[PDB]
Amino acid sequence: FDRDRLFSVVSRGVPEELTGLLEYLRWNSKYLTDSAYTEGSTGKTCLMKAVLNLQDGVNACIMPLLQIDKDSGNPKLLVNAQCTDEFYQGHSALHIAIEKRSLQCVKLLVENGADVHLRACGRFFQKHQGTCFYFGELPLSLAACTKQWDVVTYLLENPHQPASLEATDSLGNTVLHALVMIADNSPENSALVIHMYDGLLQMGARLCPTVQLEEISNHQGLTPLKLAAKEGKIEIFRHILQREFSGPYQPLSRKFTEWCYGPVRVSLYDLSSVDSWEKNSVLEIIAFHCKSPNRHRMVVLEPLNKLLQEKWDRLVSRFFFNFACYLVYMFIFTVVAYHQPFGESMLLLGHILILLGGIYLLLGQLWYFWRRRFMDSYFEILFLLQALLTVLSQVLRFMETEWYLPLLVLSLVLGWLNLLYYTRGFQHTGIYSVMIQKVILRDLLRFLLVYLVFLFGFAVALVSLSREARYRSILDASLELFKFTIGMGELAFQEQLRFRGVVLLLLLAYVLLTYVLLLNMLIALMSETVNHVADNSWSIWKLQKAISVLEMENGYWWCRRKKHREGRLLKVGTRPDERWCFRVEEVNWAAWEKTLPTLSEDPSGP
Template identity: 50%
Template sequence: MDKSEMFGFSLEADDRTEEEKKKDGVTSKTSSWSPKVPMDTDYQEEIEKPKPKLRFNLGFDKGIQGEQPQQHRDDLIFNIDRLFEAVASRDVQKLDGLYDYLHRNMKKLSDSLYQSYGKTTLMKALLHLMDGKNETVEVLLNISERLGDIKKFVNAEFTSSYYKGQTALHIAIERRSVYYVKLLVSKGADVHARACGKFFQPHKGPNFYFGELPLSLAACTNQPDMVEYLMDNQYQKADAKMADSQGNTVLHALVMVAVNKSNKSKENTKFITDIYDQILGTTNRLHPKLKLEDIENHNGLTPLKLAAKIGKTEVFSHILRREFQESQNKHLSRKFTEWVYGPVHCYLYDLASVDSYENNSVLEILTYGSDIPNRHKMLETELLSRLLEEKWQRFAGRMFLFNFLAYLVYLIVFTAVAYNKKSRKPPFTIENNVVECLYVSGQLLITLANIYFFVIGIVDMCRKRPKIKTLLVDGYYEILFFFVQGFLFLVSAGLYLWGQQEYLSFLVVCLALSWVNILYYSRGYEHMGIYSVMIQKMILSDILRFLFVYIVFLFGFSAGMCRAVNSQTQMLCELSCKLDAISAENRRLLAAPESCWQEGIDLGEVTSLARQY
């Protein structure tokens, strides 16, 4: 480490002339923000302007003495443009004299003057490999090692907000060069460096999320040899339990990059599952006590739960049915073959984090995740389908039948109370007899039931957090209708206690909806359940669209009819005024006919005019 860095700052040499400094246009910005520039391009690459930094001028004494600094020959000056051009062209000869120049001017390749948004010449060289080679890489590493800044040079990071944190090791892994990865690691490259820029995060727009870490990048790009080397080398071993900014380990990252719907989905799933199992086996060999699959991310999801949450069906099925044949990895299996006899197989499954006896289990995620893609397909996997069937046969079916009978009793009581309602103004007085006691008991029962429906509806909404589409589809009966049913009854009860006769309208609608909701319990039976779902889909698809179009036409014709009625009304008003005037004139003529003759008024003309109107 330089002595200047021990005191919290670094000191660099600067041999540029005043004209060169003005040409570079030193910026006064000190923040790490930078515009969205390409990671690398051969077409007029934008070079970051040098930022303010502590530098000493090599020609300061000549300036004090009034001497003009000696102009450097162009072939002896190595600036960032020249170095970038040399490494991009893979021409080693263009780097001749670089070490002498840097040593003479007390410069290093890790200096900020040789970086553009954090990108060094080493990164530039690795971005321009041909057939996996670029001889300038070895030259740069050799020069940096001789100058004593090799570790800083190798671990330099992008400072651009878009590619922040990316190092030369990331680039070498992405370029699939095992040779340069081994070379960089041997020179002190950090195998836990995180590429956390916006480009490496999931978002709309161009991005590549791989888990930020070099190990995750090697795994997500299908490089098993690279994964093995990073996890087990003599310099610095990559820790598989290291997590990115979202808490995702390398196993989470593999689940995230899995593909479901694609022509290459089988090929993608194959390499994802192979590397997934490889990492588990290597981790077990290096750290036998580490349970890598039990590590949760910031959302409390293990790799299995994450696969269920985002609907990665193939990876989800593989994790559930994974079985290792090697004795040293047998305990890592989730499926165990107990015995086989001919075509009969007996399997044991690990239900950890799957069954609902655990909080935030896989079953709970799939049950309440109404917006999860491929949710029904995942529930059809062998383990979950058998598990759900066992639950239904053992206790869920009986609970469903009991709920149906209780709801049927509620409907009968609700109908009886509504049919025998009193016709007086609410609230009614209570008389001391058996009939009144039964009536009040019925009202109390349906009140408690509807409060229960209302509260359960709110709880389910908070648990599922459904969108409008999923609310209509998945929560059609148990959330939407039962919640509305309870809400209507509570409004009716409030109006009743307030003494408003309008409570009856809400009560009628609530009663009708209560009878419709009995269709929900038909889902517990094989034949009626299909019919109920078919009716629901008809209501939510065809009938709903028809009602929307019908309402549009209804408003349109209503507006037109209102305009026509207003026009006819105006004409009738005008006609009525004219008839009143004619009637008054007729009365005057009949009262004084002689005066009309004297005025020269034709009675026939008046009569025809009246008939016309």
């Protein structure tokens, strides 16, 4: 017998057509998992070819193939054989039985000792861009990321193989991590991921009741909640943050109820791996580590909006004290820059003060960029550059250079721009600033590039035409051109120029082109204004205020304030289970039906 005939008869499914196969394997003493029965390209065996060709869930020739392998005395079992090509490495017949969505062949395959912890580590299975399907490199993870729940409940509970819930793949991802990894923010993908997440949580509550599956960290070092926040998956992260369970699954929930009294209701959200008191919090991961564009929506959710608002209300005095320190620094800066050569003593004291302030700001921004090694570092690089220019200006003053005065006043002007950073404290100006940057930055920069190119083109043309008498340099001609923009441009019929009509036509054409350019930018900004959603701007403003809150908690480089923990240690049940729970009050006038357990009998204020 030969491998080609075996593949043909195993694709057809007829078990009678392989009659002398065990006889040939005994007389030749060659095992079925050799290179003479696996394909040369991908290394798949005849069992994989059998389980590919399924007839309504069952293949007739898949049980004798396992039988005559047991009669063949194979040291390495036929079912455990995996592919060898680097594209598809690690793929076994169990993965094919799960992928074809057939519980019958899954049961029929695990009865014969299929090792359920088989890592599918091929290039098709790793997470990257294009022609990939990452599911967690494991049969239980593949059964969870394909919405089976019958293969899942069978692999978890069968006498032959355990298929434990705390198994990891080469990235350290468990099955919960791998359900986070596949999560899109689609309507149906999110429902799939939420269903499998809650189902496997409830099943791990009874298979391995001791361990918490939410606390396992992968090789990068994240719990599944931090991996949901880091990868920018909003809906599974929201569902994990506010999780309520009624019944014996109560210690698996995250959102408890403390007391109800008519419509008034107090809820308790546990700040485990969320509050910024610990190192790798969820707030810090959304702010400084997540790069997905919907990271501003993640600070808007229910347990996080109230938490960041409470932190902001506690820190707003420190925020405005920092604003007042910078404003006093800029006032002494502009007074020192005005008076320039009791008077000389105060002027030297003011120079010393602005040099010390520049050193202070320089060290602060250097510590900031040392820790965090656009729109997040937009003002941080500005503060850094302004402090750098100020200390360089004072150094060039001490070197008696004449060019110290341009660098000083520039450091003045830039300072009065950096004060715009303190607009995010108030809602209207902060939201408007965010909206302004997103609407106008790209359009204005492109328009400026166009205007400068057209300006210098018409300046060279205007110089070339005005050279021969019947605009001298490009500097003065471009200045006379640019004066048409500010409204002080002078166009007149010149008689001392030979080429005088064409220069008039050039100025008129430039006036028309600049008018169409300003019209272009006007209706581009107008079109961006119409197609604009204010909830997006409100969310980005909340993200800006949240990053400000997170950086104000660290304290300055000289004194590091100890982080005061939020919430209170509350007994949420008997695992006793003592968690730190942030308290959120609410009023609901449609919830008169009261099917709930409450942690506390009597209502109490904060």
